[PDB]
Write a protein that binds this ligand. Structure first.
Ligand code: 5IA
Ligand code: ZN
Length: 270
C-alpha cells in the first residue's frame, strides 16, 4: 500500500507530527560498531576466544554473577575505540530539531544518540548506558569512567567501599529495564508515525513495542530483513525499506528535501 514517498509526504505535510523511533545495533554498524545477530559479522559469531558455553551467556545476568571476567574482557575491546555518529543518527537529530520527534527508543549502549546532540529527555535508553556504573552489592553509583582503567588493566572493577563487583548500568539478560521504559504507556498511544531502524526485533519486551502503536499508525522499517511483529503481524500502513539503513535513510532525506539542513548540521557537529 504505502511507500517511502508516501511517508515522506506525510512528514512534509505535517500529517505525522509525533514520530516515535525504535533503533537497534544496525544503526551503528555504519559507525564501525558490530551488531549482535548478523551472521558472520555479529558479535554472537565472534566470541570463540571467550570462556562461554553459548555466546548469549556473556550478556546474561546469571552468568555474570557466576563469572564476570569474560564480560569485562569483551568490554576492553570496544571501550578504547572512539566511535562517531553516522547519517542515521544525524537524521534523528534533525527529526528532533524540526520538532517532529516524540521520543527515540534505543536498545544501543554506544551512546551515539547523545553524541549526536539529542537531549536525554527525548531518549529512552531501554538497555542502559556505560555513562554510569553501580556496585552490584551496595548499590553505590559511580561515573562510567571510574571503571575504565580497571577494565583496561585486565581487572574486574570492584567497589572502593565494599569490594563488590561494579557493573556498568547496561541491562543484561534477566535484568529489569530502567524506569524510563514505562514512558511507552504515554508515548506510543500518541505516536502518529513509527520508525524502526536496524534491529532484529528478537529481544523482549522492547520488540513488542512495535505493536503498541495504534492500528492506523504507519510503521516504516529500514532494515536488512523484515523482522519481528512486522513479519508475522503486518498492518495495512506498514512500509518496508529493506536493505542498508545508510541507503534507506539517505533516500528518505532526499524525498524530504532535508539535504541542505543535513549538511549544515554535519558541518557544525563534525
Ligand atoms: C562502545 C559501545 C558499542 C557497543 C559494544 C560494547 C560491548 C559490550 C556489549 C553490552 C551490550 C548490552 C547487551 C544487551 N542486553 C539486552 C537484555 C534484555 C533485558 C530484558 N529485561 C527484562 O525483561 O526484565 C523483566 C524483569 C521484571 C521484574 C524483575 C526482574 C526483571 C530481558 O531480559 N528480556 C528477556 C525476557 N525472558 C525471555 C522472554 C528472559 C528473562 C523472560 C523469560 O542488549 C543487546 C541488544 O541491545 C539486544 C537487541 O539486539 P538489536 O536488535 O539491537 O541488534 P541485533 O540483534 O544484532 O540486530 C540488528 C538488526 O539490524 C540489521 N542490520 C545490521 N547492520 C545493518 C545495516 N548496515 N543496514 C541495515 N540493517 C542492518 C541486522 O540484519 C538485524 O536485523 O540484544 C542484545 S543482548
Ligand atoms: Zn559496593
Amino acid at each position: 500500500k504505502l511507500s517511502l514517498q508516501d511517508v515522506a509526504e506525510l512528514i512534509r505535510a505535517r500529517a505525522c507530527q509525533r514520530v516515535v523511533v525504535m533503533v537497534g545495533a544496525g544503526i551503528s554498524t555504519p559507525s564501525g560498531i558490530p551488531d549482535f545477530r548478523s551472521p558472520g559479522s555479529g558479535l554472537y559469531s565472534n566470541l570463540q576466544q571467550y570462556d562461554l558455553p553459548y555466546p548469549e551467556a556473556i550478556f546474561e545476568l546469571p552468568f555474570f554473577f557466576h563469572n564476570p571476567k569474560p564480560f569485562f574482557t569483551l568490554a576492553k575491546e570496544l571501550y578504547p575505540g572512539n566511535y562517531k555518529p553516522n547519517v542515521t543518527h544525524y537524521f534523528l537529530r534533525l527529526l528532533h530539531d524540526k520538532g517532529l520527534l516524540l521520543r527515540l527508543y534505543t536498545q544501543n549502549i554506544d551512546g551515539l544518540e547523545r553524541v549526536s546532540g539529542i537531549p536525554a529527555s527525548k531518549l529512552v535508553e531501554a538497555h542502559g548506558t556505560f555513562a554510569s556504573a553501580t556496585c552490584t552489592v551496595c548499590q553505590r553509583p559511580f561515573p562510567g569512567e571510574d571503571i575504565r582503567a580497571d577494565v583496561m588493566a585486565d581487572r574486574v572493577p570492584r567497589c572502593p567501599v565494599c569490594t563488590g563487583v561494579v557493573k556498568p548500568d547496561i541491562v543484561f539478560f534477566g535484568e529489569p529495564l530502567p524506569q524510563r521504559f514505562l514512558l511507552h504507556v504515554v508515548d506510543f498511544p500518541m505516536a502518529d508515525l513509527l520508525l524502526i531502524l536496524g534491529t532484529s526485533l528478537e529481544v523482549e519486551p522492547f520488540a513488542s513495542l512495535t505493536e503498541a502503536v495504534r492500528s492506523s499508525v504507519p510503521r516504516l522499517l529500514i532494515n536488512r530483513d523484515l523482522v519481528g511483529p512486522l513479519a508475522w503481524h503486518p498492518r495495512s500502513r506498514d512500509v518496508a525499506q529493506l536493505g542498508d539503513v545508510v541507503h534507506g535513510v539517505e533516500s528518505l532525506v532526499e524525498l524530504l528535501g532535508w539535504t541542505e539542513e543535513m549538511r549544515d548540521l554535519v558541518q557544525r557537529e563534525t
